[PDB]
Design a protein around this ligand. Structure first.
Ligand SMILES: Nc1ncnc2c1ncn2[C@@H]1O[C@H](COP(=O)(O)OP(=O)(O)OP(O)(O)=S)[C@@H](O)[C@H]1O
Lengths: 398, 282
């Protein structure tokens, strides 16, 4: 029936698709038996080729759907104006599954589970595209929009989607790309320092698109830099140029709604005022506020199990998840003290930013420990004091 | 574009030599003391918030690069265990040098007991006097590409307040801003001046009762210790000066009231008091 599995590779290894495919199939057959992350390989051919094999969201006997990528170490690249005296235009670039973003998919957590939504979005996209929907009969326009409080892992989430679909589309793409021009001329807004540059960017996009053996993620954070609100005030000190900015963006999006392999992901800080078109030129809207207690506790679990995994938490302990702690009947016992304290930590950790959230432990160990010789049961209380100080600096900005 | 070995005696002692307003010694320890903690075990990078990039900004020449240097010093001091030696590098905006420079930096990285440091002056001032563009992007790519090396430490120095573009410091993970130096450091700069002046009877002697000298004497307000109070006087509202204006001050004082080949220091002292009085009537 329905089973789909991923394959992570070592850089210097250079075996072909089919060979590693057969190898991982043989491992799946040898096991034939929740998720699991194959990283320790009896088979030395695997260790020579494969790093990890994961179960991405017990039965095994199903249609083996394997996908073998290779993380690339090239992080930056050139994308700016090239005529003369032009470097700082700063259109950040990436190649597809290149290393930087490994595991970053399952990194984030959102109880709304926009993940699955966003995923089978593009899945069903290609589905229709295969069935050759007569476009103008039933039409959809390649935009996906999110927004919320700043720093909420938004750009992160975009890139995660990119990587994950990537692994889902080596079958259909040799590679792909990622664009991010955001914040460079997204805070200047001068004469065509917006417009002309948008034309240039979508020129570059247009060209870099038509590789049908390549997928395209156009990522535009800071969309609130690309809205004019249609002059909510009759003070057009800088309303005129902004109008044209908006029109450029809309027009480019449209003109490129005719490329089989183009997905655009966009995010914004301000809740409102951000457009009248985009909001209505929006295949899918989304507001992603502060994470609930669930995601907070999950992020806690994650970082804690990592620092265990890093031996930085030296005594490797074990915790209990949300419904796991629900199962113990909230019995305050030996195992449960740390986990229930962590629950109350999340509780008194309400309304924060994933930025600050997965910032916490550094400044915690900083202001409280400054020692690799440290364990849990003190790390929690020190962390809590750190978080209180974090509240106090969030109020220190008034 | 220069070199330093760790604790070797070039800047031996520069550590305490820059007392700052707001514990940043013990604080900024935490930065690397935990950065290397996390850099050891290759923690969930994608998850857990770290880079290896020191960065502050403020009034230029405020012991910032100097604190970076004495910081590499104190880092080896605290942590010669994880690093039986290490290598500090002046990467100069004055500018190929970059290619073999980061090659040498790779050499530095080659060793587990080589506490690498990446010191760059005026990191964003790259866009001040602007074909050094490949210099720019080569340094950038090297930054983002040698971070994964655990013995790497990136010592960035803004030298520009909050006017920093994307490629550099929005990349940062830990930052700090500090205003004018304390009465102590103000005093030390005054001391530099008064030594330059007592170089040739320019202001003519009483050896300068330095800060720790002020402390050891148990505050015996006497012939010279009055400096302290007048120091504090000349540090009372001195909060807000710039190092440029700081060192400019004694010059201007001598300009106003001395008008002479030389006066006894005390006249100059009250003179600079009144000069700063002017300068913060502003
Ligand atoms: N649900 C989450 N799970 C794990 N990490 C999260 C989550 N939400 C946010 N984060 C973290 O928040 C950090 C902030 O990243 P950013 O990309 O700056 O946030 P953002 O969504 O891009 O918003 P901006 O405006 O682009 S900063 C990310 O590096 C994530 O690690």
């Amino acid at each position: 029936p329905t089973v789909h599995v991923e394959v992570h590779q070592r850089g210097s290894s250079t075996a072909k698709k089919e060979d590693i495919n057969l190898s991982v199939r043989k491992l799946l057959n040898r096991h034939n038996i929740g998720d699991y992350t194959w990283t320790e390989f009896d088979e030395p051919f695997l260790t020579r080729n494969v790093q990890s094999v994961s179960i991405i969201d017990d039965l095994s006997a199903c249609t083996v759907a394997l996908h073998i990528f290779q993380l690339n170490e090239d992080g930056p690249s050139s994308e700016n104006l090239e005529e003369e005296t032009e470097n700082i235009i700063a259109a950040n670039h990436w190649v597809l599954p290149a290393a930087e973003f490994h595991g970053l998919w399952d990194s984030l957590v959102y109880d709304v589970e926009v993940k699955s939504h966003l995923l089978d979005y593009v899945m069903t996209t290609l589905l229709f595209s295969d069935k050759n929907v007569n476009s103008n009969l039933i039409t959809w326009n390649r935009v996906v929009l999110l927004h919320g409080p700043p720093g909420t892992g938004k750009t992160s989430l975009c890139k995660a989607l990119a990587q994950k679909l990537t692994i889902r589309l080596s079958s259909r793409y040799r590679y792909g790309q990622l664009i991010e021009i955001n914040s460079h001329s997204l805070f200047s807004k001068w004469f065509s320092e917006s417009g002309k540059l948008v034309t240039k960017m979508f020129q570059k996009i247009q060209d870099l698109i038509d590789d049908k053996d390549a997928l395209v993620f156009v990522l535009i954070d800071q969309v609130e830099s690309l809205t004019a609100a249609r002059n909510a005030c009759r003070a057009g000190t800088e309303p005129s140029d902004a109008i044209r900015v908006v029109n450029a963006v809309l027009t480019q999006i449209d003109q490129i709604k005719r490329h089989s392999n183009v997905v655009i992901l966009t995010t914004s800080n301000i809740t409102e005022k951000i457009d009248v078109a985009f909001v209505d030129r929006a295949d899918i809207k989304q507001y992603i506020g502060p994470p609930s207690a669930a995601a907070i506790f999950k992020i806690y679990l994650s970082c804690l199990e990592e620092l265990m995994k890093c031996q930085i938490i030296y005594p490797r302990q074990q915790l209990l998840t949300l419904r796991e702690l629900e199962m113990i009947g909230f019995i305050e016992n030996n195992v449960s003290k740390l986990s229930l304290l962590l629950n109350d930590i999340s509780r008194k950790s309400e309304g924060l930013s994933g930025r600050v959230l997965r910032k916490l432990p550094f400044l915690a160990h900083a202001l409280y420990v400054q020692a690799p010789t440290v364990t849990i049961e003190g790390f929690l209380q020190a962390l809590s004091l750190a978080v209180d100080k974090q509240f106090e600096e969030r109020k220190k900005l008034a």
